C-alpha cells in the first residue's frame, strides 16, 4: 500500500510502517512459507521503490524465493523478471545495514557476484572508481573508452551529450538516455562536502528531491544561496546545465522568494596541559585568550587581565604588575574539571 | 600457522567451557600471545573465537574484565556482527564514566565501532556516544587519550556530511586543542583529525576560529617521518583527498602520512598501490606548485621513496616563458604526448596564456573534448599561480582575487 | 509528471514548456490544457504487559485513533512522553517505575480491567471517553 504514492502520506499517518523495519531485522529468511513467476514479478516493483520499508520486504521475500528456487528448481527466472539488476543497485547505493545485508544474502544465493558499496564523495574520484562504477551499473562495454580518455569524478559529473556522442563513442540516443538516467541517480547520492561551503545541496533538495542533482553545476560556476538571487534563465541554461524549463522556473522563483581577555602564562614544561584546559574552558564561555620575542609584552599590554598558572619568566611576571591590570592566579600546589568549573564561575561573576 | 591456530582454538574451547570472571584473564593472555606473535594468527584466532554474545552478556566489576577482553576481538567480521546487536550495551556503558580502568576499554570499543559505516556513526552520535570521548578529553591519562583521539579521527574520516556538522556543533575542535601538546603520537592523531575536519568547506571557518590548525604546521616541520605507527588500501585512499585540497595544513599532514606509508610499503611489500589511488600525480603537483618549504620537502621525500623522478618547481613568471619552460611544464603536468606539437608550433608563455579551443583543436591536434577540458583545467590551475608583475602596472590581479579566488585567472586577458 | 508538475504547480506552466518538456505537440491540446489549468501531542499513553494481552492495547490504539485521540504506545522517552500525555490508560490482564509516573504529576487515569463482545466493550469504553474527554 505504501508503494502507491497517492496514499503514501495517509498510510504514513496511521503509523504501522514503523513496524516493518525493526521486524525484518529480527528474523532469518529461512522460512519456506512457491509463488509462480507472476507472483514473483509482483515483488520487483517493491524493491525498485523508495521508502526503505518496501525495499526490505522485497529483499526478504526475494531471499526466501531465491533459497527455494535454488534448492528445488536449480534454475532462476530472476534474470527474466529483472531482479538481479535491482538487487545489485540496492547493494550499491544502500545506506541501511539490514537491506544491504539481505540483498547480499540474496545475490549470493543465486550465483551472481556481490558488488561493493561505492564511495559517496564523487568529486574526488580517480579513474579506478569510475571504472568500478561503470562495471557495476552495467556499462562494462565503455570502460576502455572511459579509460583511454581518462575521466575523473569531476569530468564525469560534468560531461554532456556531445562529449558522449563524439569522444566516448556512445552512438545511440537510447543508450545515452540510459546513461544519463544512471548518472542522475548517482548525482543525488554524492557528497559535495569538499566543494560547497554553503550547503546549497539542501536548499535544492528542499524544493524537490529531484533537484539535488544540479548542485555540482550550480557550484562549479561559483554560486551559493547568497548569490543565487541574481541569476537568470540564460545563465541557468548555459552555465549550469539545467535543461528542463520547468526546473529552471521553479528554481528562479524559489531563489527570488528567499582583543584578548586572558594572557595565560605558564611553565611550558611542567603543568602545561592545565593551561590548555583553561584555554578551552574560558573560550567555551566567551573569554578570548592568548597562550601559545616581544609580542608577548605587546599582547599582555592589551590583555584585559592575567592568570598565573603554576605547579624569561621573571620578565613576564613583572609586566603584569607594572601596568594596571587584574590578576587571578590558579594555584596547583576533587575533580580538576569541577575545580575549573568553579574557577570559570568565579570569573563570570567577576569579569 | 596450523598447529598454532588449532592450539588456540582448543584453549578457547576449554576457556569457554570453563560464578566468577575466571578464565577471562586466561582469554586475555591467549589473545596477547596471539597478537604479539607475522600477525595473521591472531586474526584467524579472533574470527574463530568471536561467540560475541557471550561477552555481551557479562556487560550490563566483571564489566571491567569483559570490556578489557572485547577490545582485542574487533575485526571486520566481529565489527559487523556487533553492529547488528552491540549498540544496546556499549552505548549504555558509555553513560557511566567513573572508573579509569574501564573507560579505557569503552573508549577503545567506541574507536573500533566508529570505523564501521555511516549508519553506525550516525547511530553512535545522536543516541549518546561521542560524548564519552569529548568528556574523556579532559582527563590527563596517557593511554586513554590515545584512544579518544583515534576515535575522533575515525568519526571524521568515515561518517558523512552530517556527522561532521555534528562534531563541529558539539565543539570538537576546542576539545581537541589540549590533545595537541606533549607523547608525539597523540599530537599526530589530533592533527590528523583537525585536518580531516578542515577539509570540509562548510565548517572550515568555525574550525578556524577555534584555533588549533595553527599547531599542525609547526608540528610536522618538527619530526622525521620514520615512525612505524599498515592501514589498507581503503584507509590509504582516505588520505589523498587531503593533499588534493587547500589550507596547506591538510596538505602537510597528507604528505607526512604518505611518506610513512611509502616507507612501510617499500620496505615490506616492495610494490606500490599508490598509482591506483592517484597519489603520485598529486604529489608531483604538490612539488610543482608549492610555496611552503616543509610540504615540498616531504613530498620530495615521498616521491623519492617510491621510485619516480622528482619534478622541479616551475618559474612563477609565466608571461616571460620561452619554449623550453613550456615543454618542461607540459612534461610535468602529464601532457607528454603533445610536446612535439607545442614545439613545432613554437608556443611562448604568452601564446600559452592566450590559446583557445579552436587553436587547440586544429593546430595542436587535441582531437577530443575531454582532453581539451583536462588541458584547460591544468591551464586554469597555472594562471592562478603566475606572477603578472611585468605586465600589470595597476595590481588588477588582486582586485580580481578579492571578489573570488577563482577570478585571478582572468588578469592576463584583462 | 516526469518533469515534476502536479495539480498545484500546473497553473504556472506555459506553452513553450508544455511543447518542449512534456511533449504535447498538437496546439489545440496545449491551449485546452492551459485554459483549463488557469481556470483551476499524545493523548493516551497505553502501558501494558507486553507479553500478557498486548493485542488489546493495539485494539484500543486503533479504536481511539479512529475517533481523534492520539496515542503513544510502542529508556526514558516514555517518561518524557507520559509527562506530556493528557491522561493515562492502565490496561491489565520496569513497571513500578511507570505506574508511579502517572501519579507523580497531575494527570487523568482511566484503567481498563480484564480480570460480551470485547469490541462492544471497547465501543462502550470509547463512548465513555468521548463523554469524558
From Swiss-Prot, chain A:
Belongs to the SARM1 family. The lineage of its organism: Eukaryota, Metazoa, Chordata, Craniata, Vertebrata. It is found in: Cytoplasm; Cell projection, Axon; Cell projection, Dendrite; Synapse. Induction: Up-regulated by lipopolysaccharides (LPS). Residues 259-351 form the TIR domain. Changing residue 292 to A: Reduced NAD(+) hydrolase activity. It comes from Homo sapiens. This is NAD(+) hydrolase SARM1. Changing residue 140 to A: Does not affect phosphorylation level. The gene is SARM1. Residues 125-189, 199-258 form the SAM domain. NAD(+) hydrolase, which plays a key role in axonal degeneration following injury by regulating NAD(+) metabolism. Acts as a negative regulator of MYD88- and TRIF-dependent toll-like receptor signaling pathway by promoting Wallerian degeneration, an injury-induced form of programmed subcellular death which involves degeneration of an axon distal to the injury site. NAD(+) 2 binds at residues 267-268. It comes from the Eukaryota. Changing residue 198 to A: Does not affect phosphorylation level. ARM repeats lie at residues 5-33, 34-67, 72-115. Predominantly expressed in brain, kidney and liver. Expressed at lower level in placenta. Homooctamer; forms an octameric ring via SAM domains. Interacts with TICAM1/TRIF and thereby interferes with TICAM1/TRIF function. Interacts with MAPK10/JNK3 and SDC2 (via cytoplasmic domain). Changing residue 266 to A: Loss of NAD(+) hydrolase activity. Changing residue 293 to K: Does not affect ability to promote axonal degeneration following injury.
From Swiss-Prot, chain B:
ARM repeats lie at residues 10-37, 48-75, 77-115, 118-157, 159-200, 201-229, 230-263, 268-311. Its EC number is 3.2.2.6, 3.2.2.-. The gene is SARM1. GO terms for molecular function: identical protein binding; NAD+ nucleosidase activity; NAD+ nucleosidase activity, cyclic ADP-ribose generating; NADP+ nucleosidase activity; signaling adaptor activity. This is NAD(+) hydrolase SARM1. It comes from the Eukaryota. The lineage of its organism: Eukaryota, Metazoa, Chordata, Craniata, Vertebrata. Autoinhibited: in the inactive state, the enzymatic TIR domain is held apart by the autoinhibiting ARM repeats. NAD(+)-binding to ARM repeats maintains an inactive state by promoting interaction between ARM repeats and the TIR domain, thereby facilitating inhibition of the enzymatic TIR domain. Following activation, possibly by nicotinamide mononucleotide (NMN), auto-inhibitory interactions are released, allowing self-association of the TIR domains and subsequent activation of the NAD(+) hydrolase (NADase) activity. Self-association of TIR domains is facilitated by the octamer of SAM domains. Changing residue 115 to A: In RRK to A mutant: Slightly reduced NAD(+)-binding to ARM repeats. One of its GO terms (cellular component) is microtubule. It comes from Homo sapiens (Human).
Amino acid at each position: 500500500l505504501a508503494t502507491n504514492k497517492e496514499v503514501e502520506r495517509e498510510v504514513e499517518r496511521s503509523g504501522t510502517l514503523a513496524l516493518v523495519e525493526p521486524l525484518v531485522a529480527s528474523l532469518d529468511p529461512g522460512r519456506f512459507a512457491g509463488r509462480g513467476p507472476d507472483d514473483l514479478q509482483r515483488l520487483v516493483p517493491l524493491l525498485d521503490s523508495n521508502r526503505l520499508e518496501a525495499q526490505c520486504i522485497g529483499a526478504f521475500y526475494l531471499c526466501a524465493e531465491a533459497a527455494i528456487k535454488s534448492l528445488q528448481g536449480k534454475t532462476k527466472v530472476f534474470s527474466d523478471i529483472g531482479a538481479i539488476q535491482s538487487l545489485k543497485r540496492l547493494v550499491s547505493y544502500s545506506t541501511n545495514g539490514t537491506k544491504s545485508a539481505l540483498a547480499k544474502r540474496a545475490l549470493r544465493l543465486l550465483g551472481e557476484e556481490v558488488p561493493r558499496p561505492i564511495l559517496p564523495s564523487v568529486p574526488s574520484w580517480k579513474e579506478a572508481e569510475v571504472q568500478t562504477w561503470l562495471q557495476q551499473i552495467g556499462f562494462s562495454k565503455y570502460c576502455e573508452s572511459f579509460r583511454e580518455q581518462q575521466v575523473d569524478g569531476d569530468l564525469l559529473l560534468r560531461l554532456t551529450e556531445e562529449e558522449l556522442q563524439t569522444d566516448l563513442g556512445m552512438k545511440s540516443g537510447i543508450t545515452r538516455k540510459r546513461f544519463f538516467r544512471e548518472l542522475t541517480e548517482l548525482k543525488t547520492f554524492a557528497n559535495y562536502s569538499t566543494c560547497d561551503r554553503s550547503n546549497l545541496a539542501d536548499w535544492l533538495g528542499s524544493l524537490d528531491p529531484r533537484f539535488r542533482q544540479y548542485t555540482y553545476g550550480l557550484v562549479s560556476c561559483g554560486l551559493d544561496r547568497s548569490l543565487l538571487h541574481r541569476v537568470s534563465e540564460q545563465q541557468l541554461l548555459e552555465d549550469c546545465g539545467i535543461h528542463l524549463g520547468v526546473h529552471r522556473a521553479r528554481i528562479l522563483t524559489a531563489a527570488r522568494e528567499m582583543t584578548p581577555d586572558v594572557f595565560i602564562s605558564y611553565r611550558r614544561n611542567s603543568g602545561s596541559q592545565l593551561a590548555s584546559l583553561l584555554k578551552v574552558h574560558l573560550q567555551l564561555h566567551g573569554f578570548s585568550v592568548f597562550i601559545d620575542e616581544d609580542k608577548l609584552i605587546q599582547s599582555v599590554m592589551g590583555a584585559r587581565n592575567f592568570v598565573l598558572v603554576l605547579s624569561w619568566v621573571h620578565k613576564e611576571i613583572v609586566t603584569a604588575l607594572s601596568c594596571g591590570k587584574n590578576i587571578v592566579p590558579i594555584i596547583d600546589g576533587e575533580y580538576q574539571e569541577a575545580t575549573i568549573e568553579k574557577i570559570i564561575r568565579f570569573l563570570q561573576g567577576r569579569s | 600457522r596450523e598447529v598454532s591456530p588449532g592450539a588456540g582454538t582448543e584453549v578457547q574451547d576449554a576457556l569457554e567451557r570453563a560464578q566468577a570472571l575466571s578464565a577471562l584473564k586466561q582469554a586475555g593472555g591467549a589473545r596477547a600471545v596471539g597478537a604479539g606473535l607475522l600477525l595473521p594468527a591472531v586474526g584467524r584466532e579472533v574470527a574463530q573465537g568471536l561467540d560475541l554474545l557471550l561477552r555481551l552478556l557479562q556487560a550490563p566489576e566483571t564489566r571491567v574484565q569483559a570490556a578489557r577482553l572485547l577490545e582485542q576481538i574487533l575485526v571486520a567480521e566481529n565489527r559487523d556482527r556487533v553492529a547488528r546487536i552491540g549498540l544496546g550495551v556499549i552505548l549504555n556503558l558509555a553513560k557511566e564514566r567513573e572508573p579509569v580502568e574501564l573507560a579505557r576499554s569503552v573508549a577503545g570499543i567506541l574507536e573500533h565501532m566508529f570505523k564501521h559505516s555511516e549508519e553506525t556513526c550516525q547511530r553512535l552520535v545522536a543516541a549518546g556516544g561521542l560524548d564519552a570521548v569529548l568528556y574523556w578529553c579532559r582527563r590527563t591519562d596517557p593511554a586513554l587519550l590515545r584512544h579518544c583521539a583515534l576515535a575522533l579521527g575515525n568519526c571524521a574520516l568515515h561518517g558523512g556530511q552530517a556527522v561532521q556538522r555534528r562534531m563541529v556543533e558539539k565543539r570538537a575542535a576546542e576539545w581537541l586543542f589540549p590533545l595537541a601538546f606533549s607523547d608525539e603520537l597523540l599530537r599526530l592523531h589530533a592533527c590528523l583529525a583537525v585536518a580531516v575536519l578542515a577539509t570540509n568547506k562548510e565548517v572550515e571557518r568555525e574550525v578556524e576560529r577555534s584555533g588549533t590548525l595553527a599547531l599542525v604546521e609547526p608540528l610536522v616541520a618538527s619530526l622525521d617521518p620514520g615512525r612505524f605507527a599498515g592501514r589498507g588500501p581503503d584507509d590509504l585512499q582516505r588520505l589523498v583527498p587531503l593533499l588534493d585540497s587547500n589550507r596547506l595544513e591538510a596538505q602537510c599532514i597528507g604528505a607526512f602520512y604518505l611518506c610513512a606509508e611509502a616507507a612501510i610499503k617499500s620496505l615490506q611489500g616492495k610494490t606500490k598501490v599508490f598509482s591506483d589511488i592517484g597519489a603520485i600525480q598529486s604529489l608531483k603537483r604538490l612539488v610543482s606548485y608549492s610555496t611552503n618549504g616543509t610540504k615540498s620537502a616531504l613530498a620530495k621525500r615521498a616521491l623519492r621513496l617510491l621510485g619516480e623522478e622528482v619534478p622541479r618547481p616551475i618559474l612563477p613568471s609565466v608571461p616571460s616563458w620561452k619554449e623550453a619552460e613550456v615543454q618542461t611544464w607540459l612534461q610535468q603536468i602529464g601532457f607528454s604526448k603533445y610536446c612535439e606539437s607545442f614545439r613545432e608550433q613554437q608556443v611562448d608563455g604568452d601564446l600559452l596564456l592566450r590559446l583557445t579551443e579552436e587553436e587547440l583543436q586544429t593546430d595542436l591536434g587535441m582531437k577530443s573534448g575531454i582532453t581539451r577540458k583536462r588541458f584547460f583545467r591544468e591551464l586554469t590551475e597555472l594562471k592562478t599561480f603566475a606572477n603578472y608583475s611585468t605586465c600589470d602596472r595597476s595590481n588588477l590581479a588582486d582586485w580580481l582575487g578579492s571578489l573570488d579566488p577563482r577570478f585571478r585567472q582572468y588578469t592576463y586577458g584583462l
